[PDB]
Design a protein around this ligand. Structure first.
Ligand code: CA
Ligand code: MG
Lengths: 257, 264
């Protein structure tokens, strides 16, 4: 093998998470792996980053780095820019306990850390397990993808979102390239009074599946396939361009006539 | 019947938020303009949360605080938490639309996915009018961004907009008379940001600041960058679907070719 793969490994659940430790161990059988991940398991970071403050890092004995109060984006950013020299070949984010599917992906810290590694020599991988049990399955799927990538370059697509059925490896049917499904709007709030009678509010669960058709990430994982969706960060909705332009003309906004 | 710039002093119910927080000049100038013709409820972060993007608070309940004028701050709340709570719990009657802004500084190109301004608008995408994110390319002409947003909202009152759930609006930092018009744009892109600014704490530990955005990369003629640089309001319709559809076949052929997850 002419060259070792050098991986920057991060996650949404922090350095202590079973998912990131299991992955790290499996990748280290063939690759050099630097962990740079949050100091703890926080929920709901998405792609936020810390701009109002500087960040502290801590290095463990095994060389793992925790960024203190770091988001997953902050971790990949420091890792790519300042803490690994030279820069990593690729960012791998995972294994996340829990699926990152459909229109949820924009809110996922696991996806966020991969999107921060989109400009490296390989497409970044975000790896989520549809459950909490078969980390070994997700780790073997990840190793298989990475072997694929060093065998033949993937030409287009800077981020792959990978969702792994929570199944023993022998039961996973295969791998499908998918698009993101969608959900109905989330609408539940759960109010709870504090001891003084003040109402506080919890964000409720996601809305029901809407677009879960045959070509979606939801469908593939349901049928026991690995789902691979390529993602990009361009939010432009190009199909709306003519409608919006026509509308502006019609209501006279930006025209005198 | 009577000739005024706007018909109705409260003809639409607006949930107004931002990521700069309730005390920011951009949201306070926008609130004051909007209240001339709309029924406005501010629900915004208790402080500046630039950097919050689409993050939300899941492992903790949120507490709200209501100011004398009725503005609501969500304590520790992100822009997404503010809109989600405003819409689903706090407002009665529910809003017809979410407006988020005016942000101090632009939200252009591939930065839009990192913007808390944009995230609040995207949490309002399911309402009857498309949500607006409004950002000023500068810090001076909040007045100009407010006039532009009021023009869009009067427009929505004349005629509903059919497709496009979220409009990302960037306004040049110019007097209104100097703004050239409006273009419907696409997001351009930047080089990766690459700077990390170290700074020692008083005990001699090294702390790190995230550096500024990378250089412009794709600022083509129909980009939001180009529009604003040329003195035009940029309007880009946005969606939340991250699927790189134009990569599907290539990824699919690559898989078949390396045979990952196949037997043979
Ligand atoms: Ca801001
Ligand atoms: Mg997680």
């Amino acid at each position: 093998g002419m060259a070792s793969m050098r991986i920057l490994l991060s996650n949404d659940d922090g350095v202590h998470a079973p998912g990131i430790q299991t992955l790290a161990k499996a990748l280290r059988e063939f690759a050099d792996v630097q962990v740079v991940a949050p100091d703890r398991n926080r929920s709901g970071a998405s792609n936020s980053l810390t701009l109002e403050s500087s960040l502290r890092t801590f290095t463990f004995d095994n060389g793992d780095i925790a960024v203190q109060m770091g988001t997953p984006t902050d971790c990949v950013y420091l890792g790519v820019n300042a803490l690994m020299r030279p820069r990593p070949d690729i960012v791998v984010s995972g294994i996340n306990a829990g699926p990152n599917l459909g229109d949820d992906v924009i809110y996922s810290g696991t996806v966020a850390a991969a999107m921060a590694g989109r400009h490296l020599g390989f497409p970044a991988l975000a790896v989520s397990l549809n459950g909490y049990q078969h980390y070994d399955t997700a780790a073997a799927v990840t190793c298989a993808l990475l072997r694929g990538l060093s065998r033949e370059p993937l030409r287009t697509g800077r981020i792959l979102n990978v969702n792994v059925p929570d199944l023993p490896l022998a039961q996973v049917k295969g791998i499908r390239v998918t698009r993101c499904g969608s959900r109905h709007p989330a609408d539940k709030v759960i109010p709870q009074e504090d001891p003084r009678g003040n109402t506080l509010y919890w964000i409720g669960p996601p809305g029901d599946k809407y677009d879960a058709g045959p070509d979606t990430d939801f469908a593939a994982v349901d049928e026991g396939y690995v789902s691979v969706t390529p993602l990009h960060v361009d939010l432009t909705a190009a199909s709306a361009h003519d409608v919006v332009s026509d509308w502006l003309d019609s209501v006279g906004v930006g025209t005198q006539w």
